[model samples]
Target chain A: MDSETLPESEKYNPGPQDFLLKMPGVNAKNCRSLMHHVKNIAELAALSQDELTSILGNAANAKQLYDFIHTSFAEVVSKGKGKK
Target chain B: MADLLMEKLEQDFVSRVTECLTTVKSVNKTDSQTLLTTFGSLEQLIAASREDLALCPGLGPQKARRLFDVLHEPFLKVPGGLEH
Candidate 1:
């Protein structure tokens, strides 16, 4: 209702469950692969190459997925358009 | 094998997401994932509350807020008019 309405963390920041639920290539039946493995966004973010390689059972996408995972919302926008 | 199928599933998914976010969509790493997770599929993103659109991190314009509200105050792949 006002400028003071910012709670910061809870407002726009999506929860981990929300992230995993929507992650592409992943599905309701397949997400169980992550169980007992990664827990949240930070963990998802912290995933290493080998770990993710093991997670996906192949390294082809683990590398790119890692690349696609952490880079935030700035430069990628224009770059996507510029290169195309 | 199931593992091989799952591998390709992840590969296709991550590959598509990587391509879409950076090439076709130009979103951040997780936002795209959040987009899918929040609503559970690409087809469903258009159906969420303001948080769904606003949940898209880093694209904050003054009018975009209300625009987001009526729309997301409830979310887009990206809004060309409101880029930072």
Candidate 2:
């Protein structure tokens, strides 16, 4: 229903696609929406370090930005704290 | 939206940092916390501004860097948040 409902960015999506595929009786119909969400997410991974950093804040340099994006996404995915 | 978020974050950090200085007894902690807050906040804003500039990738590095340097020791330690 929101960005949370959308598939996560690659930076954050850790689960194997096979896991989603093997969910047995689970409906795969939402996969289209998932793919669509993924398109937006792909825009993110392709972003340069400076680009992501700027999105995060200018105080972040290329290195710190890289650390932040990886850590922040990891926190969201690994910790399951979706969207703020 | 990012701007609003940044503004609110800055306000929150400033207030809480000021409060931290007031409550903590060690001047060294106060001084370092002050530095930590300033640098940490600069880090926050840099992350934010980077995001904003991502949308407008043409944003000049110098302009963004200016924001990083805005926090000076003199102004941050101004006595209003001083403890009795």
On DockQ, the leading prediction is 1
For residues B12-84, write the lDDT of model 2, one tens digit per residue. 4444333322222222244434333333432233333423322332433443333222211111122233211
- For residues A1-84, write the lDDT of model 1, one tens digit per residue: 321233332433232334444554345433345422454333444668688667766565455445545432333432443434
Error of 2 at A69 (Å): 16
lDDT of 1 by residue, B1-84 (tens): 213454354445544543333221224555555554444322233233345556555433332233233222111112222222
Q: For model 2, how does the per-residue alpha-carbon lDDT over A1-84 read when each residue is reduced to its tens digit?
A: 632443333432222222222211112443323322322222223456655444433433333323332332222222342345
What overall lDDT goes with each candidate model? 0.41, 0.31
Q: For all candidates, state DockQ relative to the true structure.
A: 0.05, 0.02
Model 1 stretches astray by more than 4 angstroms: A1-15, A27-30, A80-84, B1-84
Share of native interface contacts recovered by each model: 0.00, 0.00
Model 1 interface CAPRI class: incorrect
* Docking class for candidate 2: incorrect
Model 2 segments more than 4 A misplaced? A1-84, B1-4, B28-84
